[PDB]
Symmetry: D3
Subunit: 175 residues, 6 copies
């Protein structure tokens, strides 16, 4: 089941990301059900916005928001909901939402899957446009959902991303 | 597995629907395999028709046709095969097919997923065009499949839909 | 050529809308070139947003922004860029952008194309969600384009939409 | 303009077909406007059906229904509305609709475009399933449009198709 | 789980194929993880090529390359990754890749799913174009992947395909 | 008509490209008809390959192959066939095909359309993967078309691209 996928081959530099939402998709927010391992519809988003990258999480981790830590994965073609991709973290958008601290990691496909992103070493190697679009998305996608909100602190480097991943792994390991 | 999804949070008004076929999709009829929980191809449909809504079933239920009761879910964007959506029943198209009584429930996304369908309270709130298109689809989609057929009795209200769901739940609970 | 399409059969209640951008499309802003009648790329939009309806204009009209008046057309399936649809106005979102007063009409498919929208008589018949999504789109889609901006005054009724169309027709007829 | 495309290189065996509707598309019926050469929306179809092949017409021809003769073109990938494909006729579905005699030609891509259909010499070389699906589509697609209807006479061979094309060409040449 | 799907109802003539990659899809190579049963991204392909048919494997089998035997399934519409289709083998493209002998079976949808391919009895009934396209794909898709390669021996008949399936089944049954 | 689009605002650094084939599209080769300005199907490609970028030409130019000079335009979303995009040349793949010298320019969206490609100044700024994929595509896409072929000389810089554009413009201006 997706429930049994490892957090990673070599945490925090070598991770697996379970994809819930494809890049450039309709505005349906899917979540994996920790009960059944099935993809559930969480929300039909009300704003005319789309996730700028594939979106998902690292299994066996937990954010302050109560769910596994979230990850954005850019790829040359959108991924399948429910699929898993081997990734390498390069940056993180620190932010909080109405359910807890809720960082958004950016992890690129592992060089074993492609050489395309090998040149993305750290957060400043990400295109400025993409980072701007990501931040803008989290700032506004819940603009029409009463009671939900976001506050974006800011972009941090790979070292912070990795620390995030270790902290998230531990918090699941005992909580 | 999809095999373990509940029939619902609060049967019959608060249900979960396992989706097998997306709205406005190619004419491939998928079914979930009660054995493995996998999506199997049941038929390549021969008519140039498409399911007018997302189509699937309520788990842990059974129709006279031998499979879980069937549900049509309108949504603003097509759902993923294999996904589960929380829904509220609003009407039912009574019909029989060559394998048994085979009602088609209509259930809308739960208000917790969206406010869009909250105004659809009962069967007369559904667009006339949509109901006509649904009935017309079940009447004709098997027109080129020898030995398969449909007889559409007619549209009934939410109260009947709900009764349908309770009867289907029981029939599975002991059969 | 698209250059020769009429403003309408019976202005302002019976209009033709030239579509430039389909509903639920990638974020490419196309414009028709008054020179050649060809569809030109105007902008690759930088925000992760999509036009909530098909978007285009009424030919032989002119807004204060210097181009034909703009129209949003909801339809059950996205339209082809470059196509023309017969429509009936039902409301208008008054707004200004950096290039002039820049109202966004909402016009539904003419009953001769479908009976689906015949029940949408005036602006309050439009779904609240859709109106909210439209306004939210115009407010934020240029958020990452320096020097471009929007100020949304508000939604007005069909009578205002129609007046808008007459004023736009005249301004082209002599300017 | 599309208005200026020839009927064909070598009528009736070597024709050009202007495509209005792609294969396996949403149920939007586009027509080219003889006025402007633009693609206009004619109808939002009400049944959950799709054209089984690309659909369009031969320019400079006229059917009894008042418009150019209609053609179905199977291809390995759907064509663009507005595009033109060189084709060879292989059969025809004789039928009448509420506006006049309204034969539906079947023409395959010319061998100069592909060798794929060279083996389709005449109507019996077309897959039985495809012919059945076509006939079934014309019989039922207008089932929910009051006042519109179809009566399918039957499938005839290439020789008849060709005769159809010659008669249609003449009727335009003087009417 | 997909892990539990049978090799087939009646090996080798009546098989089940687990689909990993749809026909005419983006160039993402998915593989099912024998650990978790999840679809993993194996590679982002570097060449501008696509699998000419749906692609997957027969469960409970093993090729010399170390994974279940591979199968190409033509269908009228692309299948869902993760789905299972009942198929009948009709031919096989013998080939070796850098990881072992790596035959590519061609199996058509079972007549119980459709009558469309019933006329494809053996390898010579497959379209020449399709066979050429398949061979050409395996010959070149790894052209930009250093260290990976293919050598195509050639097309063989259904009898060979079936033998392949039996040998693959045995090799898994004890290895 | 597309026939009337200019070669460019400021040749050779500021050009317009008429798009014939979208990025990541089905393998249908469209060409614009210099007669009618319509998009014609030139070929159904036989290999399982796709153009790695949007593909088209510069109007009012002519290559030795007898048609306007060809251009590849990378963009974040595929363009519409028939559309025109303002571009800036950055490199060129010199190559010959069976109809004459047949260079393939690479031009990126003009900074007025987006800031995304402003950092692509010259050919070495293009991703190595993309250049490899382009060359590989032209080398192999005609592999199954008897009598057609390609010989790729190699990648040259923006200065060469520009020279190419000037030479192509002149050759049309008097031939
Ligand atoms: Cl783990
Ligand atoms: Cl969030
Ligand atoms: Cl930012
Ligand atoms: Cl239950
Ligand atoms: Cl049924
Ligand atoms: Cl009805
Ligand atoms: Cl007018
Ligand atoms: Cl605007
Ligand atoms: Cl509003
Ligand atoms: Cl002619
Ligand atoms: Cl008709
Ligand atoms: Cl028939
Ligand atoms: Cl087995
Ligand atoms: Cl392989
Ligand atoms: Cl071959
Ligand atoms: Cl010029
Ligand atoms: Cl070429
Ligand atoms: Cl190269
Ligand atoms: Mn959540
Ligand atoms: Mn999450
Ligand atoms: Mn959150
Ligand atoms: Mn979260
Ligand atoms: Mn069934
Ligand atoms: Mn069912
Ligand atoms: Mn049934
Ligand atoms: Mn049933
Ligand atoms: Mn503008
Ligand atoms: Mn406009
Ligand atoms: Mn504006
Ligand atoms: Mn405007
Ligand atoms: Mn008509
Ligand atoms: Mn017609
Ligand atoms: Mn007709
Ligand atoms: Mn007709
Ligand atoms: Mn492998
Ligand atoms: Mn395999
Ligand atoms: Mn292999
Ligand atoms: Mn293999
Ligand atoms: Mn050419
Ligand atoms: Mn060209
Ligand atoms: Mn060429
Ligand atoms: Mn050329
Ligand atoms: Na909110
Ligand atoms: Na039947
Ligand atoms: Na701005
Ligand atoms: Na009718
Ligand atoms: Na290689
Ligand atoms: Na060749």
């Amino acid at each position: 089941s997706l429930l049994n996928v490892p957090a990673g081959k070599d945490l925090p530099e070598d991770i697996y990301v379970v994809i819930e939402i494809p890049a450039n998709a309709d505005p349906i927010k899917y979540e994996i059900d920790k009960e059944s391992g099935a993809l559930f519809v969480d929300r039909f988003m009300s704003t005319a916005m789309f996730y700028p990258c594939n979106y998902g999480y690292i299994n066996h981790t937990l954010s302050l928001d109560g769910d596994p830590v979230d990850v954005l994965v850019p790829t040359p073609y959108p991924l399948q909901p429910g699929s898993v991709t081997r990734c390498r973290p390069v940056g993180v958008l620190k932010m909080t939402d109405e359910a807890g601290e809720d960082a958004k990691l950016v992890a690129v496909p592992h060089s074993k899957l492609s050489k395309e992103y090998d040149h993305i070493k750290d957060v400043n190697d990400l295109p400025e446009l993409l980072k701007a679009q990501i931040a803008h998305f989290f700032e506004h996608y819940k603009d029409l959902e009463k009671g939900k909100w976001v506050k974006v602190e800011g972009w941090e480097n790979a070292e912070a991303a990795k620390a995030e991943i270790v902290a998230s792994f531990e918090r699941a390991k005992n909580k």
